[PDB]
Write a protein that binds this ligand. Sequence first.
Ligand code: GTP
Ligand code: GTP
Ligand code: GDP
Ligand code: GDP
Ligand code: MG
Ligand code: MG
Lengths: 104, 426, 426, 102, 428, 427
Amino acid sequence: VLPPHTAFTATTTYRAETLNAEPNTAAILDRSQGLASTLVGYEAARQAGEVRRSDPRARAEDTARGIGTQTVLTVPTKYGELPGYQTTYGAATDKMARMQADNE
Amino acid sequence: MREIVHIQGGQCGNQIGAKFWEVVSDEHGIDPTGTYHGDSDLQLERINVYFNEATGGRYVPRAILMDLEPGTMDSVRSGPYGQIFRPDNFVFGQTGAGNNWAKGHYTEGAELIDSVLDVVRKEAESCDCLQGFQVCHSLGGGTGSGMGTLLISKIREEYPDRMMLTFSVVPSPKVSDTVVEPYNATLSVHQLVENADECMVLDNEALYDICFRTLKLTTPTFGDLNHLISAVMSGITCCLRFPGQLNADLRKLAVNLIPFPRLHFFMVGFTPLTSRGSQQYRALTVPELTQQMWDAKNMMCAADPRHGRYLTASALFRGRMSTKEVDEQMLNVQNKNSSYFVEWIPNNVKSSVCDIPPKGLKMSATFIGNSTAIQEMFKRVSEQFTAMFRRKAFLHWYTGEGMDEMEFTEAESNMNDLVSEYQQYQ
Amino acid sequence: MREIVHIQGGQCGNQIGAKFWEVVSDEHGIDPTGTYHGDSDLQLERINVYFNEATGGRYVPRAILMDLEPGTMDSVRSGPYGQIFRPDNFVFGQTGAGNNWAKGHYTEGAELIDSVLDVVRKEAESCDCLQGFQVCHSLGGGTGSGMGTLLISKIREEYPDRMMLTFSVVPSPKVSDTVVEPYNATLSVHQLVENADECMVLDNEALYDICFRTLKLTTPTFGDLNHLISAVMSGITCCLRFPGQLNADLRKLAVNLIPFPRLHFFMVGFTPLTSRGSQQYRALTVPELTQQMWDAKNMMCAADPRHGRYLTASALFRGRMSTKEVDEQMLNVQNKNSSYFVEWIPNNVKSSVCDIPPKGLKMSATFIGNSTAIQEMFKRVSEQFTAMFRRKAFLHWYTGEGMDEMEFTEAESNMNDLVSEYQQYQ
Amino acid sequence: DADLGKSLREGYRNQPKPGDEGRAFGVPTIRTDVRLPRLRSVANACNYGNEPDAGQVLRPPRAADLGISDEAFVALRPKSELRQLVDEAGLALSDADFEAAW
Amino acid sequence: REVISIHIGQAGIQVGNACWELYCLEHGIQPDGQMPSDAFNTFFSETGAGKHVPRCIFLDLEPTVVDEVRTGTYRQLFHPEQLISGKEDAANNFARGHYTIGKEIVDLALDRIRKLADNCTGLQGFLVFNAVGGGTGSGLGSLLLERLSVDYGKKSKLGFTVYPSPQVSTAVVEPYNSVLSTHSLLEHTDVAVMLDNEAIYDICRRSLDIERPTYTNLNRLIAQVISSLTASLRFDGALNVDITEFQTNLVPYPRIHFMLSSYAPIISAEKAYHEQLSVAEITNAAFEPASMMVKCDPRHGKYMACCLMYRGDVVPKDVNASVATIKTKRTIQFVDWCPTGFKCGINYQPPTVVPGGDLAKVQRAVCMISNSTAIGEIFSRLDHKFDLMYAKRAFVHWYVGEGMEEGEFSEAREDLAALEKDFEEVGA
Amino acid sequence: REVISIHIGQAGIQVGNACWELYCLEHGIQPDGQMPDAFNTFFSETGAGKHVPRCIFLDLEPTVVDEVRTGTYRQLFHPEQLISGKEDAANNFARGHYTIGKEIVDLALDRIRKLADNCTGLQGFLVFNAVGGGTGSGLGSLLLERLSVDYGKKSKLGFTVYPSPQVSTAVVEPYNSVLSTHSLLEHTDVAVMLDNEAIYDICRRSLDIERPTYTNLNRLIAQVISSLTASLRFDGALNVDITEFQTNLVPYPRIHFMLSSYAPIISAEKAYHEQLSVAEITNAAFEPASMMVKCDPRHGKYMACCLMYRGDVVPKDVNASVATIKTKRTIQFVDWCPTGFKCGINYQPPTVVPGGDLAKVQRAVCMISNSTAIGEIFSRLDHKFDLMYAKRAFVHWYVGEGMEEGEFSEAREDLAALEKDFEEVGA
Ligand SMILES: Nc1nc2c(ncn2[C@@H]2O[C@H](COP(=O)(O)OP(=O)(O)OP(=O)(O)O)[C@@H](O)[C@H]2O)c(=O)[nH]1
Ligand SMILES: Nc1nc2c(ncn2[C@@H]2O[C@H](COP(=O)(O)OP(=O)(O)OP(=O)(O)O)[C@@H](O)[C@H]2O)c(=O)[nH]1
Ligand SMILES: Nc1nc2c(ncn2[C@@H]2O[C@H](COP(=O)(O)OP(=O)(O)O)[C@@H](O)[C@H]2O)c(=O)[nH]1
Ligand SMILES: Nc1nc2c(ncn2[C@@H]2O[C@H](COP(=O)(O)OP(=O)(O)O)[C@@H](O)[C@H]2O)c(=O)[nH]1
Ligand SMILES: [Mg+2]
Ligand SMILES: [Mg+2]
């Protein structure tokens, strides 16, 4: 028996990215905005970021710290940081991130 | 615009063509009642290359079936997409060649080839601009070999300046279905080297090996083998039917692949091929397609590509892709395996990109190589032919019908000088 | 970036690798289905060193399991995290070696090594910046020692510039699991002394002693020993996967630990190992870690290190720690125990610190020692080798497959000269 | 795949900051949009805002010799301050005409 | 002042697809073809009321991409009579494109360009777009150039041709096609602008770090280069030049016309936000080999004449200072017999971005067109790979059966060798 | 006026991480990179309200580099400057100078050249490195080679972290160090020696911190660099730029290896404790307990000393303090140099970093001097180097990379000539 059905959806490159340039670029760059440069390469990370995107203060410290919790959705998180993982760079720049979030 | 008409010869050719037409109809969104039910406008654009509109949305394939036994016609009519064909392209004899090349080329041909030429003419100047003919057949049988090759000779005489693709499945000693396979094959290829424009070489052993290793199937039936071949046919003709970033039609494929007029037997393969278990553990990238493309275990011929050198190669790609990645992927694979490529030709790989992959996939590809490894297969059949001709075994069925020993002698000479030319250029 | 590909050889190697991938998956936060669900993006940041992304975040390990018996593969698939391996990478024979080095290195190798090389070549070319290979196996079995050893030799021929780790478990007379242990181990190390870049030596007697005394487990099954070995692997490879104050990669550790080219056999230990009863009452400090690190009975080999001198030592610390504390502890332990260290090398200890400890712990440490104590074990095995070879007992099962006498004589000679040069530098 | 035409990495992306959808990413040659320095240094090869034209400095207004810079004229000034300037100078003009001109 | 554009082949008309979108964005014309509320006069002729039709002809043998454009949203811009479509491709065969199928469509092409020029008033010259590697762009392009030269002769023909890259390629007989193209490209067109593919690939990998660039990015960048070239005609500037100053100043000898091109600053949004942008460093960026449209090493050659177009907020003082610094710098050496080897130009309108593009809007930009001998090295490199295939007579039989022979191959090879000697002689 | 910075190695770029944080705090530039002329010596102003540093981070292992990239200072350093490799040199001088060298130094120079083109009054280069490792040693020496051959006449200040006598973490760092010196002797114009164990002693005795990490050491080094550059950055009563350093501190072209010290190394409670004035801080900046390199200056004679005072300081009392120092007999100078002091005064006091261990003080002193303690350090290193070289240990790695024995012998004899040079000069 033949396969049930498969819809035709693929468009040509000319119709795709030199005629719908604005929506194409909008969607492409909306896929990955909050991810870090060394982190964006992974599709799992991209999906995690999209679901995460789907408190203003907490957002401020998150965007100031940068690489803290971009793909989060056992170990409970404390008010300042996570028990298991605490990098030296974060320990050094905690105060700078705090003041940057305060200014934001 | 560009036109391709199809001819189906013999039992194997008829089944392969039936599967091919099913696949093409699914791709173009026409249901087996001959009516259109596609969704995207991209399907309407190039349905004149394979179909004709009759009346009220009825699309009929541009194909001609030709055989000698009602069993094949009944089998292709019973199955799905069997009622879309054309009853007057159902041109048809009654006796049966009985796996005899002399019977297929001299006895029943003399009374069916007039009719098949009349119908193929009618359909050929029914259209405006022919691009090529497309005939699918075997090289071991009786009906598809002899009558098919005489049809090729007639078409070459009547239209000299059109492309012609002949999709030929070839025999092997390991899979011998008839005892006169080298006898039929030698004469068929003797006619092909002088009349055919280019042939796609296929064989059952490599298809079974693929279904064993890569597909990991347990029951690789003839339907499955014909489905693989039909997918390859759709892949090679995809450029004429869909737009791409770098278009490559049949004639430029020929001029890029063929360096010398006699070297037009090409080995072909398809990607991606993954099992149901391993489809979830695999990526879909240009390097991922390339490593499978250039694998020897992906090949659908019983000839080791690493046993010789590649004269030329071509890679058709389907999907939205990075032309840069394609270019440096071919460049890197050529630089790495430098010994296996010919030296006096730089840039041995011609790559093309199209924007429409097959339905349900993300990225697909077809590989067409013109290498010198097929001289092994030609020696393989030549030794068998000499061994049986040494004492004229099984020969009187040809001699008593009109065949003479001279034709066998010229066929042997052609095989010898062809493999000599392969060895010379290797 | 840096890429490590894993190879598991034989039954013990396969089980050890299964536990290794369980613990690494737990560390990186990917479930036994292959989907990420972890807590920190520092896990994602360096998953590429061990995993490949297939479809929609389906991360698969970059490991090849290879053996000659379906039972090990069946057990690997039955266990949890056994569904994350790519089914294509299960390269696998059918007949079995049967604790025969000749069968694993000359007979079954001829039909399995080509496939394993093909798969490993695919997996190594799939990566961008290759760092090294890591192979887990034994020196007493047949299909684990000889076959994996020939694999190592072929790999070293193909990639003479890349990193290589050999995790080898070795036997002892007290626990003699097979009868041809010296006959196998002598040849295995004979090939390793020029093939592998470094081999880290394990044994079951030391693991049993550790579990009895320090861990106070009642029934230390093979699972616990494999867990200890896997934890050591994670410790030795954590520097690539996580940042720290002072990073040391595999090449850095090799150049720090290996003074002369032939001296690349190490003995390793892990800390802290605390009994479950005494876990609550015991402090967590850098001296706390160092005290259990330098415990001579905490080593994982039956070569009590105080019977010789240390050439080089290396300590990989994990956790938030004080560098002044670390290097002052190293200075104290090296100054007070003056006689146990080599005199013509100041500062015999190389330290490195990573900020990310293993899950569930605060501070951990992996100790790697390159000392002259292993000459005792090598003499201990060569004596049994000579004793058995004196009547040529069991030798005909090896000579009747391709071996002669001179290979065994050369193996004996190389053991003798290697132990002699340990004695010289002692 | 997502990275088919773009970079998609945060360091080199083409998406500008949300504050300004369109702004000329570069350094203007006039440097008007800079806080005027408290005391201009001896050597500055770049100008700031409203410098007099070559023709106007060649044919100067009269107060330039007294020391009033050209910018003091075009500088915006308030009602009371300009009224006081008018009174202190000898304009001698009435309130109606003052309101008309203002 | 007007100039007309003809696009021959897949590459040429795709570059034109990018170019016309960019031009419409620059001049404020919606794709329907009307202006909601005279500078456009060089490209668009206003027909009747509320319409603006481009001065362009796309013509090609295969109909795929042409009717793709027909079915696209730029249907109201180009009405379907300027879009000239054949029936069967030249199939990467110079002989087929110049002898078999060319003779039928070239007459209609001439008959359309004739009325285009007739409708025009002050025609400055022609500009052609093609890649010599293929069949149509080689054969039909050469034939069309020959017919246009015998028709007009005294009008300059700006040919923006794409040669095949040294190591990156997609065809097999493109050395043959390129040699046969150069045979007439040397002696018919007046100013030939060179382009490659892998050079732009490396540019996008280095500056724009697009690890996976498609043809559209390259076409957009080439379109920006052409816009920078034409900005002097389209808008007024402080120091303006038409196409005639190029024809005079940029060529020292009647045969030496092969100009390298460069653009700056090819940069993204936050990178541009990061970097301080001025005249000196963009002039510096315009001169290293890491920013040239063609992969050649200028360090091995000596410059002969260079021209620098500037767009946006640029004064003459700082560009004069930058040119002085470049002249004083010793890494790049001009030829002795040219004391003044620099020609600048400045225009007041900055480059315009295309929405969805990979470039950010910038205060000022620079386009470089220069002469050197690395072009001669490129030609020799192509000649060697031509000769290697030609020694074994590979693929000759296709051309022979088409109707062409060995004589023109011999003549083209010796012509390329003569050009090599000419470059080596002029370099001294 | 401007001076540009290059940070080589995992240690160097962490020192730079401290340095640029301190600079941004001192100039009031937020981590995002924008303020809400003095900055012109370190930051170039781009766009509208944005300043970018004149620095280049370079290293081979990407872990620390992209740690910096994705940390809090993502906006400050834009990724066109943060050069990153593919694989580490594995503490192998041969690997970092001969194998990985030629594929990254070209990019480093091609970026530094256009930074130099952007800057106008370039004072010089300052490089941060540690000679113990391979990347800091090998390609650092290569970078010095190529910067010297490219400019020559421009000043280069190399701040180098030398290995300590006893407290050590590497094994082949004697080989790496001597291979570094063979080029650092002849190429860098002002080399400043730093040690880890000496700073450990300083932080244990003064800040009474019992568990110090690399962060405090880097913070103190950054404070030293800022104190040394503040004279160029800000106006003062008696201000001193890059050039007098070379003029006054380098008696002979082959003797440029300077010791450093800083005071007051004090905490908040101890700043509450003690009165900090010029006399006592000058006294504190001369005992070996506050030397940044573990060596005894009493064993040697001071060739020349340079004293920077920051904050509320006046010429009278600094002259009184230097007079007292000269009259004190405990430290003895060289006869051939009767006047061996170079003073400098700056008005803006040292700034503090939130979370730092130092307290804000009225004034501070940074001392940089020449002696023969460095000469005895070199002999101490040479002894343990030849101890290893006697057995040809670890030489197989270098020779397999492509190095050989002639240049090992050349480095050994060059350092012997150097120690003889100090011995002859000190008399
Ligand atoms: N820059 C750029 N080059 C292209 C593009 N498409 C094709 N090319 C180049 O064009 C060369 C060959 O010419 P084609 O574009 O394939 O078309 P053609 O010249 O008309 O030749 P035929 O296709 O046989 O008719 C190839 O080598 C490509 O490098 C494109 O979109 N952009
Ligand atoms: N002061 C200070 N020194 C450091 C720091 N980190 C590392 N070091 C020193 O650096 C020396 C070794 O160099 P590495 O840290 O490995 O960096 P490297 O020189 O590039 O060597 P590679 O590992 O080959 O990259 C050690 O002896 C340490 O003393 C730090 O944060 N501060
Ligand atoms: N792939 C494929 N091959 C077939 C099929 N049926 C027959 N063949 C091949 O065709 C060859 C013989 O051709 P034959 O049936 O004698 O052609 P005939 O003369 O028309 O009867 C055999 O070697 C078969 O391998 C089919 O359904 N699929
Ligand atoms: N640590 C550990 N060692 C094992 C395990 N299974 C077997 N071994 C060791 O493997 C050695 C025998 O190797 P063998 O299984 O014969 O290797 P083979 O040739 O692959 O079958 C014995 O000395 C065991 O100590 C296991 O699960 N864990
Ligand atoms: Mg074309
Ligand atoms: Mg390092």
